[PDB]
């Protein structure tokens, strides 16, 4: 009635991708930023997809 | 027997096979490409190659 397997799959996908991006070691401060911004953006994409 | 090469001897031969490229070949025509510059100058390693 409510849950959608497709959307929820994309949700585990972006979960994995956020774990991937989170473990990405970086040296520059700006890269450090774009990492966390990238994570927020993934959390956005999941809602568009759902 | 293999044939005698024509330049080995002094007779003139007036019918000869000439290889020729066809319409499907073309040489020296200018050619198009997609150049793609690096996203950051500071990401470009010069060495150790």
């Amino acid at each position: 009635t409510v849950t959608n397997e497709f959307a929820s799959r994309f949700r585990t996908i972006v979960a994995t991708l956020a774990n991937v991006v989170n473990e990405r070691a970086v040296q520059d401060d700006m890269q450090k930023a774009t990492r966390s911004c990238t994570k927020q953006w993934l959390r956005h994409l999941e809602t568009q997809f759902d | 027997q293999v044939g005698i090469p024509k330049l080995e001897v002094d007779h003139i031969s007036f019918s000869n096979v000439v290889s020729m490229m066809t319409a499907n070949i073309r040489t020296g025509d200018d050619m198009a490409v997609e150049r793609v510059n690096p996203d950051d100058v500071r990401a470009i390693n010069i060495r150790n190659a």
Binding site: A25, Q27 | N45, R47, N48
Partner: protein, 76 residues
């Protein structure tokens, strides 16, 4: 500082020590007993301050310095 005479042992030791305190090679300690540490690549990376591609590889993946079979340490 001492053009004509031996460096007094106290100064030699204290400077050598403070400089030893200054050094820290990147590494990922592990429990495998077969493992070694690629001293050459680590000290090199450190010397270039991790700017060379090897220094990048090391600053991001220090574990790459650890190795069992000696050759693979570089193949990696």
């Amino acid at each position: 500082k001492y053009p004509s005479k031996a460096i007094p042992a106290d100064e030699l030791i204290d400077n050598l020590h403070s400089w030893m305190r200054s050094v820290h090679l990147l590494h990922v300690r592990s429990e495998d007993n077969t493992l070694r540490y690629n001293w050459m690549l680590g000290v090199y990376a450190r010397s270039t301050n991790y700017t060379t591609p090897v220094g990048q590889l090391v600053v991001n993946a220090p574990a790459i310095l650890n190795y069992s079979n000696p050759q693979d340490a570089f193949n990696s």
